[PDB]
Amino acid sequence: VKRTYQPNKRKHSKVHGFRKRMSTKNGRKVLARRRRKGRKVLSA
Amino acid sequence: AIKKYKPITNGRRNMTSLDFAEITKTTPEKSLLKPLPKKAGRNNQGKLTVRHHGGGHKRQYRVIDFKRNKDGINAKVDSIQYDPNRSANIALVVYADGEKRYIIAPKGLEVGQIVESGAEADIKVGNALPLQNIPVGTVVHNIELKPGKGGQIARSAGASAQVLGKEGKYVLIRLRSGEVRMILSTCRATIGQVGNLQHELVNVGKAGRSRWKGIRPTVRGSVMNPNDHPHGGGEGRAPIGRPSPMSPWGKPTLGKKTRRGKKSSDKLIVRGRK
RNA sequence: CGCGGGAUGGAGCAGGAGCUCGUCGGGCUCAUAACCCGAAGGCGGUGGUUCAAAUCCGCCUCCCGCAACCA
RNA sequence: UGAUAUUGAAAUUUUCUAACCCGCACCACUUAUCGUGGUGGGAGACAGUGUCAGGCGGGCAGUUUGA
RNA sequence: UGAGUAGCGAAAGACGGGUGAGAAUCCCGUCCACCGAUUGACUAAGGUUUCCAGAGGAAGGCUCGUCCGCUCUGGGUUAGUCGGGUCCUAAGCUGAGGCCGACAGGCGUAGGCGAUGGAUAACAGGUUGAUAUUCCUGUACCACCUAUAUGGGGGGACGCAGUAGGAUAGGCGAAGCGUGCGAUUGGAUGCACGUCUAAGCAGUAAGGCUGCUGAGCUGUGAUGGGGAGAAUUCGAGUCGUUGAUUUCACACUGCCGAGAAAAGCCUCUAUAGGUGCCCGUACCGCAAACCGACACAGGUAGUCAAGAUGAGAAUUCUAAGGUGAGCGAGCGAACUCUCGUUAAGGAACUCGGCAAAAUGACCCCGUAACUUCGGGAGAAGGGGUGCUCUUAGAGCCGCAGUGAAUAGGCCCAAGCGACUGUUUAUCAAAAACACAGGUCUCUGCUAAACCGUAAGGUGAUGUAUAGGGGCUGACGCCUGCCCGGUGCUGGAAGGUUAAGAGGAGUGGUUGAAGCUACGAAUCGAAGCCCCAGUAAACGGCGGUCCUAAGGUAGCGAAAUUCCUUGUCGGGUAAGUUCCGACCCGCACGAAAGGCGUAACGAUUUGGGCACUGUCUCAACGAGA
RNA sequence: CUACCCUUGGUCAGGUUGAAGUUCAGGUAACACUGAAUGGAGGACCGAACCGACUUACGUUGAAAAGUGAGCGGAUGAACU
RNA sequence: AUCCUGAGUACGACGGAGCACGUGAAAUUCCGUCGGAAUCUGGGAGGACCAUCUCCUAAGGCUAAAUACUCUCUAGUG
RNA sequence: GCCGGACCGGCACCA
Ligand SMILES: [K+]
Ligand SMILES: [K+]
Ligand SMILES: [K+]
Ligand SMILES: [K+]
Ligand SMILES: [K+]
Ligand SMILES: [K+]
Ligand SMILES: [Mg+2]
Ligand SMILES: [Mg+2]
Ligand SMILES: [Mg+2]
Ligand SMILES: [Mg+2]
Ligand SMILES: [Mg+2]
Ligand SMILES: [Mg+2]
Ligand SMILES: [Mg+2]
Ligand SMILES: [Mg+2]
Ligand SMILES: [Mg+2]
Ligand SMILES: [Mg+2]
Ligand SMILES: [Mg+2]
Ligand SMILES: [Mg+2]
Ligand SMILES: [Mg+2]
Ligand SMILES: [Mg+2]
Ligand SMILES: [Mg+2]
Ligand SMILES: [Mg+2]
Ligand SMILES: [Mg+2]
Ligand SMILES: [Mg+2]
Ligand SMILES: [Mg+2]
Ligand SMILES: [Mg+2]
Ligand SMILES: [Mg+2]
Ligand SMILES: [Mg+2]
Ligand SMILES: [Mg+2]
Ligand SMILES: [Mg+2]
Ligand SMILES: [Mg+2]
Ligand SMILES: [Mg+2]
Ligand SMILES: [Mg+2]
Ligand SMILES: [Mg+2]
Ligand SMILES: [Mg+2]
Ligand SMILES: [Mg+2]
Ligand SMILES: [Mg+2]
Ligand SMILES: [Mg+2]
Ligand SMILES: [Mg+2]
Ligand SMILES: [Mg+2]
Ligand SMILES: [Mg+2]
Ligand SMILES: [Mg+2]
Ligand SMILES: [Mg+2]
Ligand SMILES: [Mg+2]
Ligand SMILES: [Mg+2]
Ligand SMILES: [Mg+2]
Ligand SMILES: [Mg+2]
Ligand SMILES: [Mg+2]
Ligand SMILES: [Mg+2]
Ligand SMILES: [Mg+2]
Ligand SMILES: [Mg+2]
Ligand SMILES: [Mg+2]
Ligand SMILES: [Mg+2]
Ligand SMILES: [Mg+2]
Ligand SMILES: [Mg+2]
Ligand SMILES: [Mg+2]
Ligand SMILES: [Mg+2]
Ligand SMILES: [Mg+2]
Ligand SMILES: [Mg+2]
Ligand SMILES: [Mg+2]
Ligand SMILES: [Mg+2]
Ligand SMILES: [Mg+2]
């Protein structure tokens, strides 16, 4: 059966990547939250 | 003329089509073509704002000269051609300086005819003139609403208007809908009636042909749910069940007039269409 | 099975008893009908409230309307 | 839908132009269907917009709908 | 605990030899078996070292393990030409100025980014444990470098179907050549394979179009290579037939639904030497490495496409190649599952013929009611297929000849829906939705409608033969009455009302004025009250009385009928279902359409034939 | 993932039926009309790939959190990808 | 007190808001719309408002400290 | 309750 996750390097980077997060105010809020929590990984 | 298909299949039963006899050239003028991607009833936000639009055959736009603002130069009708973007056929005309333009093809126009535009042009089918120089009683089409803007009225297949009178700086015209209204006398119109008169006689015949034309199915409100439509819900089939039939957005949709008041054309419209 | 409404000259309707048709007598007509003129004739019942009851109290004998279910 | 502000000028609703408006034409910025200016044309103290007011308003909302 | 219980995830293995502490499970060999429009081969995504060699056996592997996609150590991916960038644009995204918006921000012009498309120069052979159009060999091509010698136009550039051809690839046959082999089972002297070689460069060329184009062929490339082969040297590349799904080529014809852009490119205003970057390249890849928690019977785009049989990429057996499936050994109980057969009967089973049986290919006869004249139709129902010989006959054999496998069951009647299509991913595929067609209504264009606070948009680069919304739902015949109520449309300014205008007048305070709190006539819109019209608007179509008016046509115990298994007829031996009638319509009825309707249906319902383990009534056999 | 849409690509073994036109022949005053051949239309027919999911059996601490076996619907289109 | 001393301001009407205070007899402060003063013989406030008295002098600006907090640093505490 | 006609018709209605 076809499952929900169909990985795609380009789609992953374009939707969840660092530059996409930077492009919006709320995305920069995401990055700030992860930096505050101390995450090793900030984005895709 | 109209050709009626034999009932070889249930789909072909009662189906009719135009024979396209009046079409002389089956290919368009390359230099007058522009791309025309489909919007499918979706606006700049990406949201669907007009229902029942989508799909359909790919089309290329033909640049049409609605303005007819090339005066004093005779143009010869090169061909009559199919236009997927409008009900009327179009005419490829070649001016004496070699420039080629597309015009709405009027009824009775033929290959080799000479057309012209301007105040001094003769009253003949295909000639474009200001409404000030068109005699009363003349059948016209492609009528401007503002000088130099280009024809906006009576462009559909078989559409025409009759010049009724000349009052001051305005000309009284009767439109296809029956409404009689004033139009600035410096506005231009083309002599004659738009061709392709049998366009309206076509029996589409099957659902697929509408799909080719790009029309997606219409779902009746009464077979929806209450959260979708005021006509939704009810056990089994249901009548309207409210004082007036409703649009999907909760507005009365049978007889309720929607033309706004305080329009500048209120003083220009003499008789309503009804 | 629960709730409610009705019983008016002979007929259909009004409602502390009148309109129309029906009957009788006379007239008009060759005769009948139609028509015209006069006369008579009535609160479904059973008990009570009431100075006094078609009228109000409850019930009785039928008809009529809504409803008689969630399993 | 009315008042009032933007909002002016003359007759007695009509007129005018100059504010305001034009998903109107031409020109320039400019290899530009945006915009901004310029000129014409249309319209015009109306419209639009602000404030106040009356009306409509299951289109949408918060709730009530006893024992 | 359940319990040494369930399970150990589709299937064919056997033996010999080896290794080893230990072997059904690892390696080698022989035989056997399975796939083969694929279990074969090659691209892409995705994964990211899983790739290779040596070593190892704790844990992982549903058993075992000496083995591994596991552990340890060391390795492996080579490009001017392949794919991408240093080229082009599509949707879309972004956007200098700009427009809009409490903020945050939204939009948008020029421009820019952006392949799934356009442009663009390299082939063949060899080689490793692991890379190869990348390394090597031979032979090329492209861009640039050095020396000798900006506007116009065109083009790119395009759909779908079908047909007739040319060529080539590929298949087949003869063996023309070549290479082998030549048989201890009765016989013969026949048996089995091979039969090629690119880009580039010159010559040419079937065609096609109105000179331009054009598949392909020939030579060269190539005393090179590769080769069925013999013991490093030597070795054949020929005749016929068939023939593409490839290519000429979206060339030609036809059709309506009318089929990108931009750049590269075109056109008008030699030789010689040298240089040539970055990213990817391992491996898996219809899967044990991807998505499914798994070494999971699932899902995963494209390409290549052999023989016999055949219409076929169907069927069965095979080729190339790959595989024997990560628990086994016995036994051959019940019971369960998957298969095969079955006396006599043949739907008696059951809610219901559910399931199964039956039909089935090709060729020839032959084919009804009804019909929208197309259909219905493969209607139905019947005949023939083997092999040998002669040139349609004569023979031969079997129980049986499309001898296997694969390949419609059919008929009669009724409800519903015209039809193909769509739907509740995961209990409903339908009579529901859609539909072509009909009608009503809105909308004169900065249209109406819709999204958005707006700007900006969709509608539409459309313009009443157009666009939006409501209802109905092919087609045929048709669609009756009611405008009193509600809605909608149009009148009227008579009454009623708000802000605002207006100030009669009254009080507080100081005889006042002043300040102050109120404040009455009168004016002041839409709406409403009123009138009219409108039913394919919402609705309504009763009980002499009343109403706005009391059901026309057609249909009717119906997908509607409660009584009810109404009554009568047909069908059965027997029929609460079915069909045909009646009308007493609890409680049909004309676009929430009425009545019919050929064709269509994995629709619902009744009957019949064929057929059968559905059943009387079970029995035996195969496998898990 | 799924619904719908936008741009740009790709795919559909084989059989069957035989629409419109055209030509020839009859026929006419001229048309209508007719037969034969040609032609190859269709949300056409049968049926693989492919897309579905009607029935049934199995599975129901599954091989699988929706599957498998056998039949079944569509299969040039409102097709699938 | 001859001159100057903050004008679309103060203030008012309407609609709101902030004031403990829900429009209330609601003073006092602010916003939008519209109107709109006076000038030391002036102007504002003392909880509607008037008068008297009392206090003050809006419509310009600047101004440490006592106050709030702890991701930190230094030294310590329970 | 406020008002216009002959109760009717609009408006008003926060113990
Ligand atoms: K990759
Ligand atoms: K046993
Ligand atoms: K319409
Ligand atoms: K009405
Ligand atoms: K597509
Ligand atoms: K106030
Ligand atoms: Mg629509
Ligand atoms: Mg529904
Ligand atoms: Mg609703
Ligand atoms: Mg309803
Ligand atoms: Mg109902
Ligand atoms: Mg509600
Ligand atoms: Mg609450
Ligand atoms: Mg209770
Ligand atoms: Mg235990
Ligand atoms: Mg045991
Ligand atoms: Mg046990
Ligand atoms: Mg056991
Ligand atoms: Mg077991
Ligand atoms: Mg296994
Ligand atoms: Mg494979
Ligand atoms: Mg390995
Ligand atoms: Mg183990
Ligand atoms: Mg390893
Ligand atoms: Mg933008
Ligand atoms: Mg390799
Ligand atoms: Mg590789
Ligand atoms: Mg993994
Ligand atoms: Mg798997
Ligand atoms: Mg799979
Ligand atoms: Mg697939
Ligand atoms: Mg096969
Ligand atoms: Mg395994
Ligand atoms: Mg038997
Ligand atoms: Mg037998
Ligand atoms: Mg039998
Ligand atoms: Mg039986
Ligand atoms: Mg029985
Ligand atoms: Mg069956
Ligand atoms: Mg067969
Ligand atoms: Mg259907
Ligand atoms: Mg269907
Ligand atoms: Mg379901
Ligand atoms: Mg289902
Ligand atoms: Mg319907
Ligand atoms: Mg009326
Ligand atoms: Mg009427
Ligand atoms: Mg009943
Ligand atoms: Mg009905
Ligand atoms: Mg009707
Ligand atoms: Mg109706
Ligand atoms: Mg119907
Ligand atoms: Mg059967
Ligand atoms: Mg067994
Ligand atoms: Mg293929
Ligand atoms: Mg079909
Ligand atoms: Mg089929
Ligand atoms: Mg589905
Ligand atoms: Mg299946
Ligand atoms: Mg079928
Ligand atoms: Mg004050
Ligand atoms: Mg001051």
Numbering used by the authors:
A (entry chain 2): 2 to 45
B (entry chain C): 2 to 275
Could you pull the original sentences from the published paper?
The unmodified, macrolide-sensitive SA ribosome purified from strain KES34 and complexed with solithromycin (SA_KES34_SOL) before vitrification was imaged on a Titan Krios using a Gatan K3 camera with an energy filter. After data processing in RELION, which included CTF refinement (accounting for high-order aberrations, anisotropic magnification estimation, and defocus fitting) and Bayesian per-particle polishing, we obtained a 2.15 Å cryo-EM reconstruction of the 70S ribosome (resolution values throughout calculated on the postprocessed, masked maps using the gold-standard FSC 0.143 threshold). To improve resolution and to aid in modeling, we performed a multibody refinement focused on the large ribosomal subunit and the small subunit (head and body), which yielded a 2.07 Å map for the 50S subunit, and 2.38 Å maps for both the small subunit head and the body. Remarkably, the cryo-EM map revealed additional densities corresponding to P-site and E-site tRNAs, along with fragments of an A-site tRNA and mRNA. Although tRNA molecules and mRNA nucleotides were not intentionally assembled into the complex, their high-quality density allowed us to model these molecules, thereby underscoring the functional integrity of the purified ribosomes. Within the nascent peptide exit tunnel (NPET), solithromycin is clearly resolved, binding through key interactions with conserved rRNA residues across bacterial species. Similar to other macrolides, the desosamine group of the antibiotic establishes water-mediated H-bonds with the N6 of A2058 and with the phosphate group of G2505, and a direct H-bond with the N2 of A2058. In addition, the alkyl–aryl side chain of SOL appears to have stacking interactions with the rRNA base pair U2609:A752. The high resolution achieved, in addition, allowed us to model several rRNA modifications, including m7G2574 (G2601 in S. aureus numbering) in helix H90 of the 23S rRNA, which was previously reported on S. aureus, and to identify specific Zn binding isoforms of ribosomal proteins (including bL32, eL33 type 1, eL36). Our study shows that the interactions of SOL in the S. aureus ribosome align closely with the previously published structures of the E. coli ribosomes, validating the common nature of the SOL binding mode in bacteria.
